[PDB]
Design an enzyme around this catalytic site. Structure first.
Site, short mmCIF file in Angstrom:
data_model
loop_
_atom_site.label_atom_id
_atom_site.label_comp_id
_atom_site.label_asym_id
_atom_site.label_seq_id
_atom_site.Cartn_x
_atom_site.Cartn_y
_atom_site.Cartn_z
N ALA A 1 41.07 39.06 30.77
CA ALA A 1 41.97 38.04 30.25
C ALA A 1 42.99 37.67 31.32
O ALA A 1 43.71 38.55 31.82
CB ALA A 1 42.67 38.53 28.99
N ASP A 2 43.05 36.39 31.68
CA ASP A 2 43.97 35.93 32.70
C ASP A 2 45.35 35.69 32.08
O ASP A 2 45.62 36.10 30.94
CB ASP A 2 43.42 34.67 33.38
CG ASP A 2 43.27 33.51 32.42
OD1 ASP A 2 43.65 33.64 31.24
OD2 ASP A 2 42.76 32.45 32.85
N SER A 3 46.24 35.04 32.83
CA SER A 3 47.60 34.80 32.34
C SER A 3 47.57 34.06 31.01
O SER A 3 48.21 34.48 30.04
CB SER A 3 48.39 34.02 33.39
OG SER A 3 47.77 32.77 33.66
N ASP B 1 45.15 33.73 28.84
CA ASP B 1 44.53 34.51 27.77
C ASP B 1 45.48 35.58 27.26
O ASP B 1 45.53 35.84 26.05
CB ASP B 1 43.23 35.13 28.27
CG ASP B 1 42.11 34.11 28.42
OD1 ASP B 1 41.74 33.48 27.41
OD2 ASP B 1 41.61 33.94 29.55
N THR B 2 46.23 36.22 28.15
CA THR B 2 47.17 37.25 27.70
C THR B 2 48.33 36.64 26.92
O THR B 2 48.81 37.22 25.94
CB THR B 2 47.69 38.05 28.89
OG1 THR B 2 46.60 38.34 29.79
CG2 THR B 2 48.31 39.36 28.43
#
Lengths: 50, 72, 49, 50
Positions: free
Chosen positions: B33-35, B37-38
């Site tokens: 999970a990228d920025s 997604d987080t």
């Protein structure tokens, strides 16, 4: 004047609440599509990042 | 128990199943999970529990376990 | 804006508190000034006698 | 940011074509000179196969 801004804060809070439901519900579907797309389409064919 | 919320929502937000997440791992890099997604994950957690988490506290959830640590 | 509003409310309450003290002081001063006006009239009366 | 944004789409299109091209071949390219030397190897294979 400030109590009306508080009441403005309440109105803005419910707007935020609406936006938040939109976001979570959208991700629920993104999940499924990116599950199915892994049949090599996403690699470069559908993901036209231009 | 109540943690079933988190361990459910996490998967529903990251595409992994309930047991896939390991407490030792980190969302930022060990879950994919990228920025964005987080941010979506933390904000969905906020929605589920009908509460608020400021930016400073919200940034302290990079590890899997933290998602319950602030909850319970 | 939420935290600002909370902080502005705390400041507002503090300014309201000090004006409540000055409002009380104004009523005490009005009482002293009523007595002061009476004292002037009493002196004018004594001068005539 | 404006300069980078104006520049971005061209670079992205170029990168997609480059990735497709080098993946179509067995060797992976990294620089202009590298592409030229690959040209020369291609010519040699032409003139042997012929």
């Amino acid at each position: 004047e400030m109590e009306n801004v508080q009441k403005k804060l309440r109105k803005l809070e419910r707007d935020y609440y609406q936006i938040r439901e939109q976001v979570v519900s959208a991700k629920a579907g993104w999940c499924a599509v990116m599950r199915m797309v892994k049949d090599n389409g996403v690699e470069r064919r559908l993901h036209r990042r231009e | 128990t109540i943690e079933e919320r988190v361990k459910k929502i996490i998967g529903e937000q990251l595409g992994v199943k309930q047991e896939e997440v390991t407490n030792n791992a980190s969302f930022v890099e060990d879950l994919g999970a990228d920025s964005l997604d987080t941010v979506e994950l933390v904000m969905a957690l906020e929605e589920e529990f009908d509460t608020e988490i400021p930016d400073e506290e919200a940034e302290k959830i990079t590890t899997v376990q933290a998602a319950i640590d602030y909850i319970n | 804006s939420h935290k600002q509003l909370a902080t502005e409310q705390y400041r507002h309450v503090e300014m309201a508190r000090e004006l409540a003290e000055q409002s009380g002081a104004s009523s005490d001063l009005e009482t002293d000034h009523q007595a002061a006006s009476d004292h002037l009239n009493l002196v004018q009366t004594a001068m005539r006698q | 940011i404006q300069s980078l944004t104006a520049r971005a789409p061209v670079w992205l299109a170029a990168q997609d074509t480059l990735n497709q091209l080098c993946e179509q071949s067995g060797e992976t390219l990294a620089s202009s000179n590298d592409v030229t030397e690959y040209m020369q190897q291609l010519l040699e294979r032409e003139r042997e196969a012929t």
